[PDB]
């Protein structure tokens, strides 16, 4: 992990190579041909054309982050999923939407009873 320099009396820490896996994110080959590229568990300063996003899973190239939330289609991870949609057509990455937000009007003297099935 660490060594002493033999000439100057100095601590040096050693960290091995970054490496990692590369994955490709695509829709069906009849829908489109453009793809996105994921480099797993690396920082985006070590990857070498814009649209480069940093994720807890890794570095994503070829997809743009959108603040909207949708259902997950192609899962990357850490709550991040990608999809192919318009905005003409492009691959986007977003945070998962768990579902529609609902409020139930609870009260101490109110009940709801179905009238049809």
């Amino acid at each position: 992990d660490a060594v002493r320099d033999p000439q100057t009396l100095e601590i040096l820490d050693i960290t091995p190579c970054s490496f990692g896996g590369v994955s490709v994110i695509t829709p069906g080959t009849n829908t489109s041909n453009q793809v996105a590229v994921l480099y797993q568990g690396v920082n985006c300063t070590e990857v070498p054309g814009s649209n480069v996003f940093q994720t807890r899973a890794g570095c994503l190239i070829g997809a743009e982050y959108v603040n909207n939330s949708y259902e997950c289609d192609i899962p990357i991870g850490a709550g991040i999923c990608a999809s192919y949609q318009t905005q003409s057509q492009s691959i986007i990455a977003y945070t998962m939407s768990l579902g529609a937000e609902n409020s139930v009007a609870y009260s101490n003297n109110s009940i709801a009873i179905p009238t049809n099935f």
């Binding site: 899973a57 850490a78 609902n102 139930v104 709801a112």
Partner: protein, 412 residues
């Protein structure tokens, strides 16, 4: 007596991946050409580990993701005097987690990260902790706001004391028992929650299963990295020194044993991970079934959702697992009496419509099974079936008619 117990179930483990060349060959060139001649072992290992990781991602989805919509509690919090502050999330903390979930997160303890840089990669889960906590909060809000109605169709509002009356009516106790003892049951429930809050904190061996899962994964990866530095009957355990000291025609046969040893170690690791994945799948299926039955409804199965007659269950998230809080009804202080199977009044046998015939020693009453509530034996509490000479153990008594004296007083 109202009792509240725990049950801890693991749901998933860590997702891992390994490289073909990097683990077996330390970036050597001729080592790759020698490994290429063997075949396609690491293709099968890669497919097996990818399937394991996908299965582990599906395991948490099958348990927590069971609600259609995300529910919230009303801003005012008064549920019939029942006090749910220990399980609802606290907005003051930046992570919306209950004190129980914070205690479970702090109890499980997750240089060794830099050692796993020889081709081993740990992949993050698809669902993070906040998202699982949002599922848990939605399930809690649905089960304390709408009862079991949201698990079947759309959520229907109902007051919580009336929901408790419905749950009592499902275990054989009439609903007047609750409404006459509301404060006592609320106090018992609050005391049970207060005791179970620090019951987990007092004993350090309660969360054994999740710690066992993380320790098994850690020691498996650790012993794989240990075995990477073995010799397997060769002159050296490092490739760069052995290739640079002998000529290739002997270096080839000398490193072939290293190839075989590291390959066999990889096969053993993959097989052990597959067996552990099968066990974790079985545990996750059990947890999903328990979430579907105990939380979204009332279960008639004996000793399934806790000890005693089941009333409710509450889910909590834990590192690589789920914790069920089972609320059950337990009987208490007993009294014995003399009983009879039937009552003979006018040559007709009278059987109880529901309940049991009881006597203190002088008079006879009929009461419900799970609670002492004596009532006068009338003609509406019993039904007539047959004569008096066929049932053994039948006794002498009278049955009050609520109809005859009203007529013989009012008509005359």
């Amino acid at each position: 007596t109202i009792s509240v117990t725990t049950e801890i179930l693991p749901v998933s483990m860590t997702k891992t991946s390994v490289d073909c060349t990097m683990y077996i060959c330390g970036d050597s060139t001729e080592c790759s050409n020698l490994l290429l001649q063997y075949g396609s072992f690491c293709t099968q290992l890669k497919r097996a580990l990818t399937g394991i990781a996908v299965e582990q991602d599906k395991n948490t989805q099958e348990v927590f993701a069971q609600v259609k919509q995300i529910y919230k509690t009303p801003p005012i919090k008064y549920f019939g005097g029942f006090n749910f502050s220990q399980i609802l999330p606290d907005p003051s903390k930046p992570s919306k987690r209950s004190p129980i979930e914070d205690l479970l997160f702090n109890k499980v303890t997750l240089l060794i990260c830099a050692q796993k840089f020889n081709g081993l990669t740990v992949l993050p889960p698809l669902l993070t902790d906040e998202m699982i906590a949002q599922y848990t909060s939605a399930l809690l809000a649905g089960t304390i706001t709408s009862g079991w109605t949201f698990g079947a169709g759309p959520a229907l509002q109902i007051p919580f004391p009336m929901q408790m009356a419905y749950r009592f009516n499902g275990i054989g106790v009439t609903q007047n028992v609750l409404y006459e003892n509301q404060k006592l049951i609320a106090n018992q429930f609050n005391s049970a929650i207060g005791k179970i809050q620090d019951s987990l904190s007092s004993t350090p061996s309660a969360l054994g299963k999740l710690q066992d899962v993380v320790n098994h994964n850690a020691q498996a990866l650790n012993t794989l990295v240990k075995q990477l530095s073995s010799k397997f009957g060769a002159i050296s355990s490092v490739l760069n020194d052995i290739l640079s000291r002998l000529d290739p025609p002997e270096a080839e046969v000398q490193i072939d044993r290293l190839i075989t040893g590291r390959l066999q170690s990889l096969q053993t690791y993959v097989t052990q991970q597959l067996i552990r994945a099968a066990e974790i799948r079985a545990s996750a299926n059990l947890a999903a079934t328990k979430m579907s039955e105990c939380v979204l409804g009332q279960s008639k199965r004996v000793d399934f959702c806790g000890k005693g007659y089941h009333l409710m269950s509450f889910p909590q998230s834990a590192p690589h697992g789920v914790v069920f809080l089972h609320v059950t009804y337990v009987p208490a202080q007993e009294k014995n009496f003399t009983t009879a199977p039937a009552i003979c009044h006018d040559g007709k046998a009278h059987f109880p419509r529901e309940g049991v015939f009881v006597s203190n020693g002088t008079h006879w009453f009929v009461t419900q099974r799970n609670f002492y509530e004596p009532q006068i034996i009338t003609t509406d509490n019993t039904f007539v079936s047959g004569n008096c000479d066929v049932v053994i153990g039948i006794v002498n008594n009278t049955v009050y008619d609520p109809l005859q004296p009203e007529l013989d007083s009012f008509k005359e």
